[model samples]
Target chain A: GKTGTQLLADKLKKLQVKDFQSIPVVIHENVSVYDAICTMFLEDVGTLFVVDRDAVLVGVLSRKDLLRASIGQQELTSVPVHIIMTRMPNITVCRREDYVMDIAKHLIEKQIDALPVIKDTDKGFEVIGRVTKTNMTKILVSLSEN
Target chain B: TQLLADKLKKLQVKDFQSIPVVIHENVSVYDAICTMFLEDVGTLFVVDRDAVLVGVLSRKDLLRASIGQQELTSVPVHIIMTRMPNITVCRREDYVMDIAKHLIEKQIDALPVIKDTDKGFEVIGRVTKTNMTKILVSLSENEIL
Candidate 1:
């Protein structure tokens, strides 16, 4: 007796990010952009989280960042990831308890491919998982199938 | 609002597909990367001299050449592009549902829209997760009758 698309909208709105987030791909703050590219291919991820010795979230690296660094560097090995990464306080983050559509909203609104899901501790935000366009696409496809 | 009901009932890729950015097959990987940044595109369709789509180059594929031993300027894109048979595509008539499914199941971000012709597949448009994300956001906010 209820509406059709309305139900789908509700289901999407009700979905928690915890259910859809993928594993965080983290890197050391001082890792070379060269190694980061290798890790990206090995891990097959679009974004990488940068952490300190404590492994607390510090920065973010994207394919664009790596690609730019790879362009004209004398020695890619010497260029630490921290140099090119989007430093902290500027990175967009999400929480596990947040809604998928809410995050999806920001992905479109903010023009970003992914958002890190972080766990706030006394020291800093620990990398947990991330939400990408792939995750949003999956949610759309899954709901359409139902 | 003649378009309202029809739009609610169905949405096709043709309605949302963006104009595809394409490159000549013989172009260097270095040039291809330049085009990517110039066009601000995540995907680039590679075509032969005949203007037929011969390959598809996504960001991942571009980066592969980035770390490769060969010089980017000397190597042609055909050497590393996803060749003809392995490339997945969608037609202009395909529904958004099918396109979205392919993007997920195939684990790829975008697909080139093609038209089968006498010579070969001709690239017409493209659909990606960004477009898909927009659809979802529209559904959440736009009024539906």
Candidate 2:
């Protein structure tokens, strides 16, 4: 019979990002911080994926970004989100085929709250979904109960 | 056995309580967001005139309040804050593990650390998931040592 750790390992390996990820909230780089904040609240998410005109992933904005921007000397309505967003190449992403456990570890090690699940297209990476710490916590709780 | 119990007792909530970011309930959402940013904190403890914790505000709350709204300056934060009776609070005497479990079970980011005063509970500090994670990391590293 599989042990507890073995069972958890099996579950983690079998669960893919696509199975758990939720729809991503995407915004444009040119959008103002105010706009980004609005979308965040409207979407009820802590993070927003910044996309280009071609819908390629460009950057990421979190509630912390908006909070920091709101306190800046610059006008919230006038400041572009791209200026404060964690830009592309710096973003941590997960693929649909990636293991849930691996992604969860990455989140903890990186001290990040969420990961944008992306697809590498011919044009560029496209943000399709998101995985968050909340999701990982749920898995951990379930594992603890077993 | 006594030594182990002593070590465990040192892990009380007071030892891990972080300096909470505090704001008045009457403050505008814009002001609350700015306070959180300036403090570099994800959660803000909302207090009344006497510095008694009355509500809890998170970055998510501020974002939700700001969206689709043009008048960010005029709106009060209390309107959107998770007010008293709804907020989860922790006392200094509470165990760290209990607080960590509460955070996970409730799906909340932080808990306001309060002290029982003659009047009521007064905000003293905060305990967050980040703090708990840090403690876990530190303990694991100690195991390696």
Candidate 3:
């Protein structure tokens, strides 16, 4: 049997980078909820990264936010994403090199179902990918088998 | 100001006793209720052989179980415990404010706060609605206009 370090290395090597979607779907800082939802549908994802004109991430609009706003609210289509998006500083983010286990812990510990990965830029920031609790759970199951 | 000032106290999950009374799925509901009375806690976290949180049993669950069966002693907790679809959970790191908001919105009495550690998911604490209201009033009272 392979040693612990070797097993981890093998698992990391077997880890397919292609399976993970990179650079989550982004909404411009000025985009409306209508446009954001359209992007969500088109992207087939639950979260939309809100970015500035220069591609700097400003916020995140999640399914919960949309659902909460749409329910018992008027004219959801006309509302700007700014009104619904979870503004920066509160948004949970992960770095590219962060281990799947660490990311998974953050997801469950924070009780947030999803996390946004961002890359620091000279000017601001760039979207890297989005990881969900379900994704991490699957990874954990696979990792434990080894 | 003629507003009725309600005196309230709030305690976070951390302040609660972490020693939650739990039992195996095969354990009898009667034994579970007995444990509840002995522990003096109304709720019990139910776990499986792997110690995974599968269900929760409240005093009401035992009462419901007793109603259908003439002999409550033989009935398993699995027969009456609240299952997955009905259960709600809170995480340990969550602020008291968040738990308070949820308790108020849901009109629920208590919440099970669990910790997702390196080992696995485990119960860490409990936050009751009454605890949250008390905390709010205490904080508000300390504030200066």
Model 1 clash pairs are none
**DockQ for candidate 3:** 0.02
Taking the tens digit of each residue's C-alpha lDDT, what string does model 2 give over B33-94? Answer: 87876687789999999888889988877766655455778888888899998889999989
lDDT of each: 0.85, 0.76, 0.59
Tell me the tens digit of each residue's lDDT in model 3 across B56-129: 88654564454333456677788778876566777765555455555545644466777776655566666653
| Regions of model 1 farther than 4 Å from truth | B1-10, B142-145
Question: For each candidate, what's the DockQ?
Answer: 0.43, 0.16, 0.02
Q: Give the alpha carbon lDDT tens digit for every residue of B1-145 in model 1.
A: 3333334436688888899899999999999999999998889999999889999998878887887678999999999999998899998888787788899889899999998999889999999999888787666654333
| lDDT preference between candidates 1 and 3, better one | 1
DockQ, cand. 1: 0.43
Please name the candidate that would achieve the greatest lDDT relative to the true structure.
1
Worst 10 residues of 3 chain B by lDDT: B1-10
Model 3 per-residue lDDT at A59: 91
Instruction: Put down candidate 2 lDDT per residue, A12-62, tens digits, no spaces.
Output: 556788887888889999998888877876887888999999999999988
